[PDB]
């Protein structure tokens with residue numbers, strides 16, 4: 466209503482119910498908007514974000530609606546700290562979810578997680594919107610086990626100069642020259658498929674970031690997780706061509722994943 470723009474949520478409409486944990490920006494809480502709608506309330510610590518630039522981008526991010534993207538509902542910008550209000554994902558981070566051995570996942574479930582992320586990425590690619598930090602830690606899981614991509618493009622507003630740079634999810638042209646493109650998101654997606662089929666292992670787990678950078682620069686790569694079929698491995702490996710222009714698009718990766726779901730059903 467009055468005094469609130471389309472991207473602005475009145476904080477008085479929030480009911481705080483439980484603490485979910487602490488992220489890089491601060492505390493995340495589960496709550497309700499206008500007494501009945503589930504939301505996650507992200508409290509942004511002062512000095513951690515380029516707030517004015519983020520607020521302007523929030524307007525664009527609210528227009529990015531896809532069932533496999535963690536929806537941005539709005540921002541509470543009139544106070545310190547500011548809040549980012551998003552879709553609630555009851556099962557938390559994909560990385561922690563993969564690491565919980567109790568789930569005893571079938572490979573069909575792992576491929577479905579890949580397809581969830583790929584559909585979100587295909588959507589972002591259709592809108593010429595880069596994620597810029599795609600990785601399992603940036604995906605969330607809802608109460609139905611659906612995986613959704615979160616914090617798309619948010620790395621552009623991080624003030625900590627340490628960003629902790631995602632060396633292990635970066636292609637040679639990013640490490641060598643800072644060349645970000647649709648093709649650096651493609652590379653990151655391949656690493657994410659590897660994280661999923663490896664049940665949340667750290668990519669290049671025996672190497673430091675410096676060693677990872679040198680390994681990649683020499684044209685060497687991650688290798689096949691035990692749970693990946695030959696066809697699944699061919700798809701993740703296709704994301705890692707040295708030449709960015711030889712890497713597929715998300716539309717092609719989606720077509721590949723759907724083909725493997727059919728063949729290996």
Ligand SMILES: CN1CCN(C(=O)c2ccc3c(c2)[nH]c2c(C(N)=O)ccc(-c4ccccc4Cl)c23)CC1
Pocket residue numbers: 485486487488493505535551552553554555556557558561605
């Ligand atoms: C063992 N446990 C059982 C119940 N679990 C949780 O209670 C739970 C835990 C975290 C998160 C979570 C749920 N939901 C969100 C959301 C969201 N938009 O809903 C965003 C960020 C995080 C988030 C991500 C990284 C670090 C800290 C955090 Cl907070 C979480 C899930 C796992």
